[PDB]
C-alpha cells in the first residue's frame, strides 16, 4: 500500500491473508471473507494453473502478520472459468474453507454490493493490504496492515489515461467493462496487495466494490490500479455461496 496509515485495529474485520508453504507460511496475496465459509480473492494469485491445496492456507484478520498465525485450511479452490490473465479479464476466484468460522466481535463478513450499483467517482473508498509500500520496498518487519483512501476514476476516462505514452491505438479498449480503476500517483495498491478488497461506504455500510487485480507498477503517472468490478460477477458468485 502506497501512502495511508496503519489501520486501526477494529476497523477492517474481513481482511484475509493467503499464505503459501515455504521456509515459512509466507504471505503472498490478499482476500476478503465474504461468507462464513467462503473467501473472495483475485484469480491470478492462485490460477491459472492448478495448485496443490496442501501448499495453501488462509489467515484471518490478525493485526500483524505472523504474530498469531492460527492458519485455517482451504478445502476447495474455484476460479472463474474464463480467467487466464488479469489483463484479459475475469481475475476473480473463490476459496471454500474447510471449517466455517464463528462470526465474532473481531470477525465479520463484508457485504457484496447489489447489482444495480455503479460506484460513480468521488465516493469514499479504501483499499487495505500488506503489500509493498513503493516499488521494491518490502513492508517493514512489524508488518502492520496498512490502509489508504483512494479516488475512483470512471472507466472511459481511465482508458484514455492508460493510452498516454503507449503505442496502442485508442480504438483498442484496454480497460474492459468488467474492470474498475482507482488510485493516484500518491495512493495505490502495490505488489502483494493483489486480491485485497476495495470497499466503499455507501449509506454508512461497507460494500466491496472490487478486487485488486493488476496495474503497470505502483503509483506511476497516468497508471491507475485496475480492479475487478465485483458487480460484474454476482451471477457467478451466487452460483456457489448461498444467502
Amino acid at each position, epitope marked *: 500500500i502506497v501512502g495511508g496509515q496503519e489501520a486501526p485495529r477494529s476497523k477492517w474485520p474481513w481482511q484475509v491473508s493467503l499464505r503459501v508453504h515455504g521456509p515459512y507460511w509466507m504471505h503472498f496475496c490478499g482476500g476478503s471473507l465474504i461468507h462464513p465459509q467462503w473467501v473472495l480473492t483475485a484469480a491470478h494469485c492462485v490460477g491459472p494453473d492448478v495448485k496443490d491445496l*496442501a501448499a495453501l492456507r488462509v489467515q484471518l484478520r490478525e493485526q500483524h502478520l505472523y504474530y498469531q*498465525d*492460527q*492458519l485455517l*485450511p482451504v*478445502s476447495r479452490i474455484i476460479v472463474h472459468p474464463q480467467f487466464y490473465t488479469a489483463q484479459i479479464g475475469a481475475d476473480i476466484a473463490l476459496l471454500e474453507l*474447510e*471449517e466455517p468460522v464463528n462470526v465474532s466481535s473481531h470477525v465479520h463478513t463484508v457485504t457484496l454490493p447489489p447489482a444495480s450499483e455503479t460506484f460513480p467517482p468521488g465516493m469514499p473508498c479504501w483499499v487495505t493490504g500488506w503489500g509493498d509500500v513503493d516499488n521494491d520496498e518490502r513492508l517493514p518487519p512489524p508488518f502492520p496492515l496498512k490502509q489508504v483512501k483512494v479516488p475512483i476514476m470512471e472507466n472511459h476516462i481511465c482508458d484514455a489515461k492508460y493510452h498516454l505514452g503507449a503505442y496502442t491505438g485508442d480504438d483498442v479498449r484496454i480497460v474492459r467493462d468488467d474492470m474498475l480503476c482507482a488510485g493516484n500517483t500518491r495512493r495505490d495498491s502495490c505488489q502483494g496487495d493483489s486480491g485485497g478488497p476495495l470497499v466503499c461506504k455507501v449509506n454508512g455500510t461497507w460494500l466491496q466494490a472490487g478486487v485488486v487485480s493488476w496495474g503497470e507498477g505502483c503509483a506511476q503517472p497516468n497508471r491507475p490500479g485496475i480492479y475487478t468490478r465485483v458487480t460484474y460477477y454476482l451471477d457467478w458468485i451466487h452460483h456457489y455461496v448461498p444467502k
Partner: antibody
Amino acid sequence: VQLVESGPGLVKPSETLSLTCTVSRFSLIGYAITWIRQPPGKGLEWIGGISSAATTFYSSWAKSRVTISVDTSKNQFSLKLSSVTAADTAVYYCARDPRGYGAALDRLDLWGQGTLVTVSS
Amino acid sequence: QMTQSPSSLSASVGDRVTITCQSIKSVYNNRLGWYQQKPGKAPKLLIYETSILTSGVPSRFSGSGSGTDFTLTISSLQPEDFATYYCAGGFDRSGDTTFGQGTKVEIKR
C-alpha cells in the same frame, strides 16, 4: 522429518492413557495430526484428529472418552483416553495430514512408528 | 461404512491384481486414498485423491473410481509387494470418515 510417539505402554483398567506425539525436526505450524488405532490383527481404526486451526474432531464412539490437545510451546500434540479397558489394547499411531484437514483420512502422508499400549492387571 | 473386496487374495509374481472398495454413499470431493501396510510397520500412503500417485512409488500402482466405487490395481506383483492394503475415504468434512477392513495379499510361488 518424522513423528515420534511416546507413552507408558502399560496401564491398568479404568486408568487414563496419555500419549504424546512430537514433531522431531520442524515446526508443526500449519499441520493437522490424527490418532490411529490398530487392535491386534484387526484392521486400522480412526480415533480423531485436530486441524491446523486447532479444531478437534472425534470419531462417533470416541467423544465420550477422548481428548486431543496441542502445545506449540513444546512442539507437541497430546492424546488422553480415560477409563481404558482391555479392549483398548492396541498399537497407536499419530500421523500428519499435509492439507491440515482435521478430519480426513485420504492423505495421511507421514506416520510415526507407533507404539503398543497394553491394558493389563 | 465401507466394504473392501476381496478380504484376501494370493497371486503369483508378475500377475496383475485389482482391489475394489465401495460405499453406501459417495465420497466427498474425490477424498479417497489407499495405504500399504508392511507387517510390523506403519502404513505407507500410496494413492491419494482417488488417483494421484505418491512420489517414490513405482507405476505398478493405479486407481480410479466414480465417486461411489473405486479400484486399486497393481500391474505386476513383486516380492516387495506383500502387504495388507486399505482404502480410506471421507464422506464429509468433520463427519464420517473411515478405513475399510483391508486386504491381505500373499505371493503364490
